[PDB]
Write a protein that binds this ligand. Structure first.
Ligand SMILES: O=C(O)C(=O)CC(=O)c1ccccc1
Ligand SMILES: [Mn+2]
Ligand SMILES: [Mn+2]
Length: 191
């Protein structure tokens, strides 16, 4: 029925992530109870976008004093209007070229937008498909603990990246234990 994946998703992710994913799905005519893999992919992509942004200020790491600037602006998880409202703001502030497609983050240290990709397939092939459908720096994470980033520029320190890669390796294993991995993987478009 999809009950099994749906319940896994609700206990895997925190309630903010879950609410945001449900919100995104209802907005576009999608029921979280029915398209349960999508439900899991939407949550996972949010968590990675938030993990990537956590703790980073200007350029230092803090786990938060009042004069610090957040290193990253977060564009994902906002409706389209708001999403574009925020990109316009960054473009006025910084003078950066406005991208043609919505990105996921803006990095105020490097002054570039970031496309974060997450895939159950292999990391390189997915990177290449994303680089073809797009200036915007791309960074892909796989569920098996890999990443690929534009020009071998990984933006963050290794410990930060290890935290996201381990988070994702762990979701795979937890799903795998429940005999849900194989079907979650297979549902992703492409080989
Ligand atoms: O797939 C991703 O990694 C996205 O980050 C997708 C995204 O934001 C989007 C924006 C406009 C239309 C459809 C997807
Ligand atoms: Mn996005
Ligand atoms: Mn993305």
């Amino acid at each position: 029925s999809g009950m099994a994946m749906e319940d896994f998703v609700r206990q895997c992710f925190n309630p903010m992530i879950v609410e945001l994913a449900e919100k995104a799905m209802k907005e576009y005519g999608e029921d979280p109870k029915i398209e349960t893999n999508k439900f899991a992919a939407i949550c996972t992509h949010l968590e990675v976008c938030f993990m990537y942004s956590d703790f980073h200020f200007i350029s230092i790491i803090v786990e938060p004093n009042a004069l610090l600037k957040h290193r990253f602006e977060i564009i994902e998880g906002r409706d389209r209007i708001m999403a574009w409202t925020v990109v316009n703001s960054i473009c006025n502030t910084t003078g950066v070229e406005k991208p043609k497609f919505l990105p996921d983050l803006y990095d105020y240290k490097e002054n570039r937008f970031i496309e974060i990709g997450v895939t159950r397939r292999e990391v390189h092939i997915y990177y290449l498909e994303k680089a073809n459908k797009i200036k915007t720096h791309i960074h892909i994470f796989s569920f098996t603990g890999e990443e690929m980033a534009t020009k071998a520029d990984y933006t963050l320190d290794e410990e930060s990246r290890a935290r996201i890669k381990t988070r994702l390796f762990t979701i795979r294993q937890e799903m795998a234990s429940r005999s849900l991995w194989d079907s979650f993987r297979q549902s992703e478009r492409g080989e």
